Design a protein around this ligand. Structure first.
Ligand code: F05
Length: 330
């Protein structure tokens, strides 16, 4: 089997991407944030504290003839930005772009933090990291991909995120028309539950490539590119007036600037992030200070190849017995 679904930016800055997902019988379509940096499929629901729902579409398990309470199971998750959610668990039928999994754990939110409430466009998350990170207790549950894997034509999914435009998540096949040149594959460590890999270095603009190992995660659920302070300083030093602002919480730059590209290595291959991809617009409405899309990972404890990096590539998440990642230009 295979599946293919379009993923769409939630706003004009590509702050996140949403993908429609069918849950239950008859189908209830919710727009979920596909997140290769976590492993829970959770949704706003009829159980979510009413004051914490503001415009989201909810899953109502009592209206699904295939929903079953997973007795005794609860979940609770925190994310890198300090947001969180928790609740109980149903199993139900879940379909993505024509690919169906029966008995998928659908984690129903009883509580969500303010950032989730305030984002009316995201109805929940669909985790695509390794199932070892799934938070369901006392019986850990499998991700949609793990449940689907054995049925797929090939045990893979691909992320093809757009810059200020829709893109695609495919399951079970590689669309050879969706990228240019070849796909370069690179080793993955699953020790921390992430799609963790080692970039071979970087360049800033038309500058020379610096060969250096950068260990990080491919994380579609993180907006920006978080890299070591040395690398980030080298980037922003090429932008007149750019500076790190403690009050704003990262590097900012004059909105009048033209940003240089940023290149990252994948083995001997190179992925080029155009400068425009690194512009996240005014820090507040009407400001001439703009927020940078490349930020320091110092204090996070891990480097993160988030959407800023991934949307410059066609990315293969290869879930074979020994997982690997693939990157192609597009
Ligand atoms: N994977 C994620 N990085 C940041 C974040 C916030 C909210 C949900 C998921 C994520």
């Amino acid at each position: 089997s295979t599946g293919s679904a379009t993923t769409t930016p939630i706003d004009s800055l590509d702050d996140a991407y949403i993908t429609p997902v069918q849950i239950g019988t008859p189908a209830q379509t919710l727009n979920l944030d596909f997140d290769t940096g976590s492993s829970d499929l959770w949704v706003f629901s009829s159980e979510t504290t009413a004051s914490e729902v503001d415009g989201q579409t909810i899953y109502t398990p009592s209206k699904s003839t295939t929903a079953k309470l997973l007795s005794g199971a609860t979940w609770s998750i925190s994310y890198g930005d300090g947001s969180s959610s928790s609740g109980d668990v149903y199993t139900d039928t879940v379909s993505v772009g024509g690919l169906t999994v029966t008995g998928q754990a659908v984690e129903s939110a009883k509580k969500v933090s303010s950032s989730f409430t305030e984002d009316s466009t995201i109805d929940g998350l669909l985790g695509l990291a390794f199932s070892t990170l799934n938070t369901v207790s006392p019986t850990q549950q499998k991700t949609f991909f793990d449940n689907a894997k054995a049925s797929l034509d090939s045990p893979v999914f691909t992320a093809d995120l757009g810059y200020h435009a829709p893109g695609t998540y495919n399951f079970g096949f590689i669309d050879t028309t969706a990228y240019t040149g070849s796909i370069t594959y690179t080793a993955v460590s699953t020790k921390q539950g992430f799609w963790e890999w080692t970039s071979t270095g970087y360049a800033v603009g038309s500058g020379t490539f610096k060969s250096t190992s950068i260990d990080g995660i491919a994380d579609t659920g993180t907006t920006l590119l978080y890299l070591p302070a040395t690398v980030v300083s080298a980037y922003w030093a090429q932008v007149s007036g750019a500076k790190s602002s403690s009050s704003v919480g990262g590097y900012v730059f004059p909105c009048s600037a033209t940003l240089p590209s940023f290149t990252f290595g994948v083995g001997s291959a190179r992925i080029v992030i155009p400068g425009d991809y690194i512009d996240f617009g005014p820090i507040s409405t009407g400001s001439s200070s703009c927020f940078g899309g490349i930020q320091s990972s110092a204090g996070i404890g891990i480097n993160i190849f988030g959407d800023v990096a991934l949307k410059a590539a066609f990315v293969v998440f290869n879930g074979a017995t020994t997982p690997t990642l693939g990157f192609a230009s597009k």
